[PDB]
Nucleic acid binder design. Sequence first.
RNA 1: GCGAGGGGAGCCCUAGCACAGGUGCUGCAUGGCCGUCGUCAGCUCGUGCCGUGAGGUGUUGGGUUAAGUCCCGCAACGAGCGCA
Length: 117
Amino acid sequence: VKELLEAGVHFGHERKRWNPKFARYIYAERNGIHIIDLQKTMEELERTFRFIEDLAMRGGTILFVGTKKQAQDIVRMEAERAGMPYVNQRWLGGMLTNFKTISQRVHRLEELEALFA
RNA sequence: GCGAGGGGAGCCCUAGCACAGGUGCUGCAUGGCCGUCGUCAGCUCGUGCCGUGAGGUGUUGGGUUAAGUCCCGCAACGAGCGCA
Ligand SMILES: [Mg+2]
Ligand SMILES: [Mg+2]
Ligand SMILES: [Mg+2]
Ligand SMILES: [Mg+2]
Ligand SMILES: [Mg+2]
Ligand SMILES: [Mg+2]
Ligand SMILES: [Mg+2]
Ligand SMILES: [Mg+2]
């Protein structure tokens, strides 16, 4: 039961601050705000979830990234509640593209994890 | 070797020979050691990112220190010669 739970308080967002390539997903500009098409979210939802379903059961990994302040914390809840990785404070340059190197910092962390206890 | 002592074994001489010797020149052929900017807060590298490219970013910015000293930020994340 997704559906009207979306209308819940989760439809529409910003205004005249838009990217016009996002025009297809918009239902209207009621009250000078861009109300995003409720139901197209649903059509995008299943397709997405289906990719996650597949990815999940294949034992793969999602990386959760929310550094904007309202998401900061609700990201680290759900990611831990999924045993998945998350990036929370700052996205660093090349966490992915220079992974090997940024990894060496994980490597260092648990050398110091190893000198507290 | 001879029972009557001649054969360049050390050693020492003179006569030749290979050589020694040169604080003669070139610090603009050099090593090394030194002076010097300056004990000044700097100079870089790896990988990533940006640029057709030289290169850039990091090392800019805000605060702070004697200090590229530390801090906060940040397409950078770290490191090395320095600083201490
Ligand atoms: Mg950062
Ligand atoms: Mg000279
Ligand atoms: Mg010299
Ligand atoms: Mg001279
Ligand atoms: Mg290129
Ligand atoms: Mg330092
Ligand atoms: Mg300074
Ligand atoms: Mg010192």
